[PDB]
């Protein structure tokens, strides 16, 4: 479970991982599911004497 | 501050627990649909767009289901992600084959949202159980929600700018557990004072006045145009109420028909007309004023609020106990329907027309000023000569600001009497003022004749300017004006004194206003943090979070307050 | 924006019909029509022609909603004539009826190519 | 891109493809503008 | 501002009778007349001329009108 | 009456109002001196002895409406009107959309709208002109019709005309400014304004810099929308920590670019680039978009009658006059008599009169015009209903109805609420894990608000159930594995394999209990504090 | 059916931006759903299609687009000939279902120039264009047909602009309507009472209550029945009133019998017989 | 701030031509807020030496 | 030197309070926009009394 970094599933090593934003979704293209987790997106916190 | 953090101020419990963010939610200004079954609510499709529902895959709809994920998010009626049992979830707008996608049961699905799907909707600021109720969804273009008229009325929404918030549960418990119980129609209601919640307003209850007229009379076509109109009818055309000359339709016949057949609601007319009784009675010439309606069909009577709903002896209370919600529910849809087409054919207006009344009237009740001009006249020389007599357990004083006060009254209570005579029954002022609406005759006084005296907590206006109110006015003046009685109307105008001493009191109203609607919002935190520690039990014993005894049973019979009715018992009778 | 676009008022999806025929399951003889894409303009005329016939024992319609646009028809006729028939015949009859006033239209501009005094 | 948005002052176009530090030629003021856009662009009468 | 071809109301078409009607006012200081004289038979139509009110000069009388 | 030939004379050549004051026919005065003067209402009648209870008058007013402030001299005959409306008014004349000055082009505000077609007030106070109302309108005087219609009007809000919508009702345009500013971000860290690729690049997250230009900024007159990237710049921060091959394009290059929120879509209207006291480079882009009337958009009457679209219609359904003239308000009737606001109608009925005459109607409450006959006379006149009521026919069958309506031209407000951007709504999104709420808002996407007092309407409601979702499920799931010996929260949970309870040499008596994660946080806050709160169903 | 009305016809009064006439023996509905096909109903051209090449003129390029469609195109040339884009199958557009128009003006001189709708030319085949001194060979000219002043340019300002003209009507939005307010009446002494005149002396007479004129204060008839109705059309100009009613009839009994067509496929989809 | 409960704000007559009455926020700042009069004017100080 | 002083719009030091509406309209300023109040960091600020 340390193989994350953006890039595993559990039927394919994941090619690629989109962010979408816009919904704060983690999608993986080439097959067809979530990832999960979206943490915070980074896109949402990216306006963030002696 | 470890403690702080939790404390509260802006901590673990308040800042967090007390209140937070919640997702499947959505809230939009409001705007009004009499058309709207009292379920619906209209919802704009971007929101339908934005909220979703993940159903678990059964076979019976799977390929339905199936086809939501085919149509996918590129259109309302599919599907955005898809939720294995094994908990994997998918996003179909970047799946390579959405539609070539397998898919079994058991498996989730996160749809769009449908119409007649059930969610749960609310006003903001949030005052009692009415407050929230389970609502069926209506998919409309623009993003604003409609509304049946009559569900604005237990919440109590303005369309000036309004919005209130609505939350779309996701469990199908909850989906019931709004169903049967969140849902407006079981609302009805109020356990709070044993009375109904509903009510039918404006223009829906001027027109039904404008409907239970003598003069009402209806065409063969207009009765079938009215007919369709019906959300629900026998498909049996009615007999013409008219034969002779020409068959025609009373407007009270009609009405019955929207009425239910077995069910019947008496007398309480509650209208000015007639007689504050005794001349009513004179002879029983019983009829078109005082309201009554048997087999579900009204024999005279024009309607009121009363009548209407939101108080006792309600035709709509007695619906609900023998109707049922869902009959009443329907049949209240459907006469807003009706009253709304009806109306829009019939149609009303107001005007300059409507503020006029007889010179000569007019010309009395100006005249009718004069004197209590001079009537006060007479009430300050005495004074002057102290040859005043004061009222027993009062100063001079407070004898004179009474009787000035008596007379400011009294006049302006008989010039404003000279109004309600001096207005025909064809003005839609007075239609609006009987109908029940917002207005009364006070306010014709105002509008016509005289708006009265202003005054700082109900006492006449002080010398804020050297024992004088203004330096237009002379030292040691007493004059009603000098003291903020506004003798004009809205018609005559004000002057630019009366106009300061009515914004003046504007003021006092809207002060009162602010503060009121702040401290109600404390108050009530300070009653629900007491009472939350209370609940019924199975053993009809009032008990609290520690299972202690509070009352041998709810209100000493551990019945319903909504089945409770008011009632005269007469064994009370005078002579044995 | 969150509402459609202005032919959609009148423009029907590859999907969506026209009309749709629908017989009464309430009384006999009797049938409801749903029309889609269309107003009680069209409705009222058609209406008053079916008012006109005799043989109808009832005739009614409406819009399900104003922002809404479709219309539903109920109609009964004698048990003799089917009020297919009677939709059939108030249609060809206003056709007709429309034909003639163009036609009078025609003639009454065609009678001023210069003045009538 | 020949565009690089005209200066707003002396009211002419730098035009180019660099990093300078928003200089304009006689007109030594900062304030620059930027050409319309070299795009097809459709509009409705509505 | 810009005078808009047809009044609300009806429709009429007023899309160069604005300056006609400066130009009649220049003619004639009768308001009834020159109201009259462009056609505006309907109120509607008058109130769409008479409450009209064009600042765009002003905006033209600045010379920075370039870029 | 010579002194009012010299005032007369100031327009040409001088007569200035100082020297008025030097003529001391009139005084500048203080409240401690009205204590002591006698004031008149009036030349005319004060002066009268005929009937003077006194006529030790010493001062009078220059008008009474001098007592009235910008706000309050906007509405005519205010004293024929209820009085808070006018506060109402005041607040909401405030609230109204508008023009504001003469050059808009040079302005790059942050948020603007203003009106396609604005018109001077139909009825107006002379004092408006001081005011350069005229000059600069805020609205339109719209020919209204009062009638409650279907309903869709009812409560603050009204029924209007489509088809005029098509003619340009209402329409505005709406600009916001965006400025965006480069600048270091250390000693040799900084922001780098550029157009980066997706492989040179990263922190672009899924964003595409198409619409960019070399420079990093889009080009004026681009098409856009809320999502892509409005201005490009990305900042390399560790410029050595880096090292040795996990080179890459995208290198450290961490991404800064700036993008749209996503709500708004549009076209850019303006790009200007600059300096500013602190010497950094920064630049700012106007963007424009249009506002158009729609359903549920907030409106409002001169008078303070405020409301809402309804609903829209197009001219043929609207029921029409013996013209045929459609007004382009519906209004119900009954809103006006509850708040008793007559002079809502006494500007239909001078607007009516005016509009017919072809000339203006002064809007001052105080006058001896005498405008409730002699108006209604002269509407007569014209060839009318003397009181204003006319008979217009339906919309639908044509009929006429059977009520008469007042109907005439009324100055309206476009009032600042796009009910547009008070929507908000989610069913899944960002989230904030340090609490596990949701985002903060809309401009974040975040969730809608739970309060104390739905939270009291949903125990008295009793659904407990859909409380736990609401609270649980709908903002903060979370599962806990306890040790069997101890209600303590402790275990290394090999998340594939093992559990166990260290400190109680836990094997498999691990349980597993749903509460809240936010919950559990304040429970660790506990522990922090040397508290061991523990927890059993026995 | 057994019997019909007769649809009495009768013009009173015509011109080329009106016509006044009073239609007899016909229902109300008739009346007005036929007068609501007056305005939405006609089949019209106009522009769909704009792009703006160059503007230094100091309003913004939408204003003017809004206006261009608030421009008042003749429609004197059967402009129901061009095939519909939509239905065209053309890509976007083209000249069987498109008119191109294209602007380009530059203010050299230094006095304001002022902007028509003659610097506005049809690119595609001359369909008649404006009404703008095309029409008007004619010495009957309201004071210069220049109809439409597009915009003032001092000295400086430009404008590069092209458009498509394309086929839509009334319903579809107003600049499709070749019609201004509508005119009708019908039993103006109210005999059928559709509404009180509460004291008739203070409804000044309309001008069709002149016929039975009348002074006492309204003749009263309860059998009675909508009958002569009076109307006068009032055309924008983008075609002659007359012409604009012919066409308006023709386009509604088309739409009819489209729909008993889909009348006969509903009962031919059905499984219903009738003969 | 200073002195407070029991004083609240209504209205002053003496404001009569000083202040318009209507012109007030809505909020809470009702009365609390004032608006300049139409031709109101303030002192700027002199020395009466 | 002391200092820089900001000042209030069409002070008597704002120079632009003797140009005519056409010399603020040539400096692209607007006729009807008295000031009063000043401009800080480029955004405008009021005085409340
Ligand atoms: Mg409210
Ligand atoms: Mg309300
Ligand atoms: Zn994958
Ligand atoms: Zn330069
Ligand atoms: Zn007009
Ligand atoms: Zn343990
Ligand atoms: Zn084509």
Redesign the pocket.
């Given at each position: 479970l340390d193989a994350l970094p953006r890039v595993t599933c559990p039927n394919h090593p994941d090619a690629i991982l989109v962010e979408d934003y816009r919904a704060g979704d983690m999608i993986c293209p080439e097959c067809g599911l979530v990832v999960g987790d979206r943490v915070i997106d980074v896109g949402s916190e990216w306006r963030t004497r002696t | 501050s470890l403690k702080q953090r939790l404390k509260g101020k802006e901590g673990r419990v308040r800042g967090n627990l007390m209140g937070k963010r919640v997702d499947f939610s959505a809230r939009t200004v409001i705007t009004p649909d009499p058309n709207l079954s009292i379920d619906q609510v209209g919802v704009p499709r971007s929101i339908a767009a934005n909220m979703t529902f993940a159903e678990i895959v059964t076979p019976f709809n799977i390929d339905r289901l199936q086809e939501l994920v085919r149509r996918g998010n590129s259109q309302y009626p599919g599907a955005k992600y898809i939720i294995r049992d094994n908990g994997d979830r998918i996003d179909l707008r970047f799946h390579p084959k959405p539609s070539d996608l397998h898919l079994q049961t058991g498996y989730k699905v996160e749809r769009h949202m449908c119409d007649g799907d059930i969610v749960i909707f609310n006003r903001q600021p949030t005052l009692h159980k009415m407050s929230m109720m389970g609502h069926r969804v209506r998919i409309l273009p623009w993003s604003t929600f409609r509304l049946n008229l009559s569900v604005?009325t237990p919440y109590?929404?303005?369309?000036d700018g309004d919005e209130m918030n609505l939350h779309l549960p996701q469990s199908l418990e909850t989906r019931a557990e709004i169903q049967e119980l969140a849902m407006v129609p079981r609302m009805i209601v109020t356990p709070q004072s044993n009375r109904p919640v509903m009510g039918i307003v404006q223009d829906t209850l001027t027109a039904v006045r404008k409907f239970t007229k003598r003069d009402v009379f209806l065409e063969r076509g207009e009765v079938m145009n009215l007919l369709m109109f019906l959300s629900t009818w026998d498909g049996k055309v009615p007999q013409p109420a008219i034969l002779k000359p020409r068959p025609l339709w009373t407007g009270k016949q009609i009405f019955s028909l929207i009425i239910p057949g077995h069910i019947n609601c008496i007398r309480t007319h509650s209208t000015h007309p007639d007689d504050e009784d005794s001349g009513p009675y004179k002879h029983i010439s019983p009829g078109d004023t005082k309201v009554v309606v048997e087999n579900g069909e009204l024999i005279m009577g024009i309607l009121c609020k009363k009548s209407l709903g939101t108080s006792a002896g309600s035709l709509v209370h007695i619906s609900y106990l023998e109707m049922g919600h869902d009959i009443t529910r329907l049949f209240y849809s459907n006469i807003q329907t009706v009253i709304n087409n009806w109306l829009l054919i019939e149609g009303h207006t107001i005007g300059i027309g409507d503020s006029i009344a007889d010179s000569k009237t007019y010309q009395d009740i100006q005249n009718t000023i004069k004197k209590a001009k001079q009537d006060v006249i007479e009430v300050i020389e005495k004074a002057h000569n102290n040859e005043l007599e004061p009222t027993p357990g009062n100063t001079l004083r407070q004898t004179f600001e009474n009787q000035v006060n008596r007379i400011l009254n009294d006049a302006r209570d008989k010039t404003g009497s000279s109004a309600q005579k001096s207005l025909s029954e064809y003005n839609n002022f007075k239609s609006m003022v009987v109908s029940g609406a917002k207005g009364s005759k006070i306010n014709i006084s105002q509008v016509i004749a005289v708006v009265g005296q202003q005054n700082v907590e109900g006492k006449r206006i002080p010398f804020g300017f050297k024992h004088r109110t203004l330096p237009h006015f002379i030292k040691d003046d007493y004059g009603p004006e000098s003291r903020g009685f506004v003798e004009n109307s809205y018609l005559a105008g004000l002057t630019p004194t009366e106009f300061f001493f009515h914004a003046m009191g504007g003021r006092e109203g809207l002060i009162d206003t602010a503060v009121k609607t702040a401290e109600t919002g404390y108050i009530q935190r300070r009653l629900i943090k007491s009472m939350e520690s209370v609940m019924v039990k199975y053993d009809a014993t009032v008990r609290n979070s520690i299972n202690q005894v509070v009352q041998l049973r709810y209100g000493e019979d551990g019945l319903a307050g909504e089945s409770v009715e008011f009632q005269n018992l007469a064994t009370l009778k005078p002579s044995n | 924006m969150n509402a459609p676009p202005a032919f959609e008022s009148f423009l029907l999806f590859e999907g969506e019909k026209k009309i749709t025929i629908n017989k009464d399951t309430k009384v006999p003889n009797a049938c409801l029509f749903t029309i889609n894409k269309e107003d009680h303009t069209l409705g009222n005329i058609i209406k008053s022609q079916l008012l006109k016939d005799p043989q109808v024992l009832f005739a009614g319609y409406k819009v399900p909603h104003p922002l809404e646009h479709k219309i539903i028809i109920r109609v009964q006729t004698t048990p003799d004539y089917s009020p297919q028939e009677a939709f059939t015949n108030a249609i060809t009859d206003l056709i007709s009826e429309l034909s003639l006033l163009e036609e009078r239209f025609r003639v009454a501009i065609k009678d001023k190519q210069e003045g009538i005094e | 891109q020949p565009m690089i948005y005209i200066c707003g002052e002396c009211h002419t176009e730098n035009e180019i493809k660099s990093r300078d530090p928003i200089r304009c030629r006689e007109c030594g003021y900062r304030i620059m503008y930027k050409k319309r856009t070299k795009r097809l662009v459709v509009f409705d009468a509505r | 501002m810009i005078i808009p071809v047809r009044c609300f109301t009806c429709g009429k078409i007023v899309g160069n009778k604005w300056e006609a009607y400066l130009g009649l006012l220049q003619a004639e200081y009768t308001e009834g007349d020159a109201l009259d004289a462009l056609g505006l038979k309907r109120y509607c139509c008058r109130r769409m001329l008479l409450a009209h009110v064009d600042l765009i000069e002003k905006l033209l009388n600045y010379a920075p009108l370039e870029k | 009456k010579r002194h009012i030939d010299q005032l007369k004379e100031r327009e040409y050549n001088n007569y200035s109002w100082q020297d008025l004051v030097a003529s001391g026919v009139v005084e500048y005065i203080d409240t401690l001196e009205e204590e002591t003067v006698m004031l008149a209402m009036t030349p005319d009648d004060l002066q009268e002895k005929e009937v003077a209870y006194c006529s030790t008058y010493t001062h009078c007013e220059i008008h009474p409406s001098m007592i009235l402030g910008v706000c309050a001299s906007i509405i005519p005959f205010p004293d024929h009107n209820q009085s808070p409306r006018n506060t109402y008014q005041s607040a909401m004349g405030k609230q109204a959309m508008g023009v504001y000055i003469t050059n808009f082009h040079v302005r790059m505000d942050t948020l603007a709208h203003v009106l396609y077609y604005p018109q001077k007030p139909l009825v107006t106070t002379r004092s408006m002109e001081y005011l350069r109302f005229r000059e600069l309108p805020a609205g339109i005087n719209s020919i209204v019709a009062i009638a409650s219609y279907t309903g869709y009007n009812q409560?603050?809000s009204v029924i209007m005309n489509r088809s005029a919508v098509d003619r340009g009702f209402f329409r505005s345009v709406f600009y916001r400014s965006y400025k965006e500013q480069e600048s270091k971000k250390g000693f040799d860290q900084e922001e780098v304004f550029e157009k980066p690729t997706r492989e040179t690049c990263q922190g672009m997250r899924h964003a595409i810099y198409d619409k960019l230009d070399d420079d990093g900024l889009i080009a004026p007159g681009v098409r856009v929308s809320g999502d892509d990237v409005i201005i490009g710049k990305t900042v390399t921060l560790p410029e050595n920590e880096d090292e040795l091959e996990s080179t890459n394009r995208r290198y450290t290059k961490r991404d800064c670019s700036t993008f749209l929120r996503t709500s708004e879509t549009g076209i850019v209207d303006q790009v200007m680039v600059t300096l500013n006291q602190e010497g950094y480079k920064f630049c700012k882009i106007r963007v424009r978009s249009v506002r158009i009337p729609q359903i549920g958009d907030k409106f409002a009457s001169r008078h303070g009658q405020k409301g809402t679209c309804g609903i829209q219609y197009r001219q043929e359904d609207m029921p029409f006059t013996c013209e045929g003239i459609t007004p382009d308000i519906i209004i119900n009737p009954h809103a006006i008599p509850s708040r008793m606001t007559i002079g809502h109608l006494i500007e239909c009925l001078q607007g009516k009169v005016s509009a017919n005459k072809g000339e203006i109607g002064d809007a001052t409450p105080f006058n001896d015009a005498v405008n409730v006959q002699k108006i209604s006379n002269l509407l007569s006149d014209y060839g009318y209903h003397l009181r204003g009521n006319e008979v217009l026919y339906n919309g639908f069958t044509g009929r006429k109805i059977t009520s008469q309506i007042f109907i005439g031209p009324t100055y309206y407000q476009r009032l600042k609420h796009m009910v547009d951007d008070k929507i908000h709504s989610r069913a899944r999104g960002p989230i904030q894990i340090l609490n596990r709420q949701p985002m903060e808002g809309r401009s974040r996407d975040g969730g809608l608000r739970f309060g104390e007092m739905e939270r009291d309407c949903q125990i008295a409601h009793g659904a407990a159930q859909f409380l736990r979702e609401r609270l649980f499920e709908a903002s903060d799931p979370y599962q806990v594995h306890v040790c069997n010996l101890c209600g303590i929260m402790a275990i290394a949970n090999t998340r594939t394999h093992t559990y166990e309870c260290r400190g109680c040499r836990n094997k498999t008596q691990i349980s597993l209990v749903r509460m809240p994660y936010a919950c559990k946080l304040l429970f660790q806050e506990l522990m922090s504090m040397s508290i061991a709160p523990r927890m059993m169903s026995v | 059916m057994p019997y019909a009305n007769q649809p009495t016809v009768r013009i009173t009064e015509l011109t080329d931006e009106n016509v006044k006439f009073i239609i007899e023996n016909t229902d109300l509905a008739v009346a007005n759903s036929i007068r609501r096909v007056f305005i939405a109903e006609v089949p019209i051209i106009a522009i769909d299609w704009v792009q703006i090449d160059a503007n230094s003129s100091v309003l913004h390029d939408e204003f003017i687009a809004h206006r261009l469609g608030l421009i008042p195109l003749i429609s004197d040339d059967i402009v129901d000939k061009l095939q519909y884009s939509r239905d065209c199958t053309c890509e976007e557009f083209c000249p069987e279902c498109s008119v191109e128009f294209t602007l380009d003006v530059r203010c050299n001189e230094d006095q304001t120039r002022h902007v028509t709708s003659r610097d506005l030319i049809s690119n595609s085949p001359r369909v008649i264009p404006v009404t703008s001194r095309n029409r008007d060979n004619d010495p009957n000219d309201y004071v210069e047909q220049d109809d439409i002043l597009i915009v003032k340019l001092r000295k400086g300002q430009e404008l590069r602009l092209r458009a498509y003209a394309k086929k839509g009507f009334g319903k579809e939005h107003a600049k499709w309507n070749p019609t201004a307010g509508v005119a009708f009446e019908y039993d103006p002494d109210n005999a059928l009472r559709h509404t009180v005149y509460p004291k008739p002396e203070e409804w000044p007479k309309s001008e069709y209550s002149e016929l039975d004129e009348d002074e006492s204060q309204a003749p009263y008839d309860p059998n009675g029945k909508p009958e002569r109705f009076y109307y006068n059309v009032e055309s924008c100009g983008s075609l002659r009133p007359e012409t604009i009613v012919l066409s308006a009839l023709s386009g509604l009994k088309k739409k009819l019998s489209d729909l008993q067509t889909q009348l006969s496929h509903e009962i031919q989809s059905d499984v219903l017989t009738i003969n | 701030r200073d002195g407070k409960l029991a004083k609240p704000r209504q209205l002053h007559n003496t404001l009569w031509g000083m202040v318009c009455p209507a012109e007030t926020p809505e909020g809470h700042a009702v009365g609390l807020v004032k608006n300049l009069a139409l031709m109101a004017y303030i002192s700027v100080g002199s020395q009466p030496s | 030197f002391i200092g820089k002083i900001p000042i209030m719009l069409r002070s008597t030091y704002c120079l632009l309070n003797g140009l005519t509406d056409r010399d603020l309209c040539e400096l692209n300023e607007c006729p009807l926009d008295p000031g009063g109040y000043f401009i800080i960091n480029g955004s405008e600020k009021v005085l409340i009394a």
């Open positions: - | 604005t109590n929404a303005d369309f | - | - | - | 409560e603050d | - | - | -």
